[PDB]
Amino acid sequence: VVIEPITNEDLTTKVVDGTGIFDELMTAANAHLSAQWDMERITGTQYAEV
Amino acid sequence: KLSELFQMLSVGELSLIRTGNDGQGIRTQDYPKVIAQLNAGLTNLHARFPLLEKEVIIQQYEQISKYYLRSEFAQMNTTSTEKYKYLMDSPTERFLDDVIRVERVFDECGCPLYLNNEPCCGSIVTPSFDCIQIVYPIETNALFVTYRANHPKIALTTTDLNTEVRIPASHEKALTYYIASQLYSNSPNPETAAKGVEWSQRFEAECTKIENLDLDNAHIAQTNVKPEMRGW
């Protein structure tokens, strides 16, 4: 197997929809948040607060 | 001008909010949001204060008894296909749908007529919010309706910043506070809703101040004519 170095770009791409691990985790949490919010269960303020 | 109002909103009042763009001018994409709120503010000020009163001539036709106050029936609006245009507009007075309240109604000679009077069967009644019903229309007559007028509506898609906002400098702050209150009150965040409420209270305080000082010469008393009418 070929191991790759762990660089800064593997954690954060410094973009909201980045290719990093933190960015992907944010996108995944935002997916659940959007799924809940599409059913008028939370307001925009609570969406941003969570 | 609209450019000055946009700059004033961007820096000073709508500063710590998205629409202000951190005090670097209102973005060219948020125009249809400040303009919608600006129209509401101008309408509020022009309805609560007499900042513009105008008259419109309504020519009476033999077969028409309900006359609608719409530009579709205007003499200068040539885009409409209406067979009879009874509104008598001029290049000076254009009647851009800017009607807030129909106050007084006269005739061609200049004799005042009753408005919304039931016992007198010679009065001009108002069926709807924009209609004028003449139960007795004559082909050789014309009305002289006088109303409190609104600011010519600024279109939501307006891009020219040279469109002049005709308000006195004393009501500039009142309008700006109203815009801030309306834009701050959309969000349900308690902290932002409190600021919106504070802006609303400050706008209602500026209006109260202008009423107390009567900067528009609105609440001015008139000569008493009751002794003459009563036969003293």
Helix/strand/coil for B224: coil
Strand partners, B146: B55, B104
- Helices then strands, counting H and E runs in chain B, come out as 5, 7
Question: Which of B33, B27, B21, B4 minimizes the C-alpha distance to B162?
Answer: B4
Contacts of A24 (CB under 8 A, 6+ apart): A18
Q: Is B186 on the interface with A (CB under 8 A)?
A: no
Structure tokens that stand for B211 in this block: 């009423």
Torsion on CA atoms B133, B128, B56, B223, rounded to nearest 10: 90
Tell me how far CA of residue B150 lies from CA of A17, A30, B39, in angstroms. 47, 46, 10
Torsion on CA atoms B194, B195, B201, B204, rounded to nearest 10: -140
Tell me how far CA of residue B220 lies from CA of B188, B208, B229, in angstroms. 42, 16, 21
Q: Is A41 on the interface with B (CB under 8 A)?
A: no
Compute the nearest-CA separation of A1 from chain B (Å).
49
Question: Residue A23 is which amino acid?
Answer: D
Q: Is A44 on the interface with B (CB under 8 A)?
A: yes
Question: Residue B222 is which amino acid?
Answer: Q
Mutation target to probe the B interface, by most B beta carbons within 10 A, among A41, A43, A45, A47 is A45
Collect all residues of chain B within an 8 Å Cβ-Cβ radius of residue A43.
188
Q: Quick one: resolution in A?
A: 3.5
Tell me how far CA of residue B89 lies from CA of B55, B59, B73, B96, B147, in angstroms. 10, 11, 10, 10, 14
Tell me how far CA of residue B97 lies from CA of A33, B65, B146, B230, in angstroms. 46, 20, 13, 41
Compute the nearest-CA separation of B190 from chain A (Å).
9
Contact between residue B2 and residue B162 where contact means Cβ atoms under 8 Å apart: yes
Complete DSSP assignment for B101-123: EEEEEE-SS--EE-BS-SSSTT-
Collect all residues of chain B within an 8 Å Cβ-Cβ radius of residue A40.
none
Provide the experimental method for this PDB entry: cryo-EM
Q: How far, in Å, CA of A41 to CA of B66, rounded? A: 49
Contact between residue B33 and residue B14 where contact means Cβ atoms under 8 Å apart: no
Contact between residue B199 and residue B184 where contact means Cβ atoms under 8 Å apart: yes
Q: Is B231 on the interface with A (CB under 8 A)?
A: no
Contact between residue B60 and residue B90 where contact means Cβ atoms under 8 Å apart: no
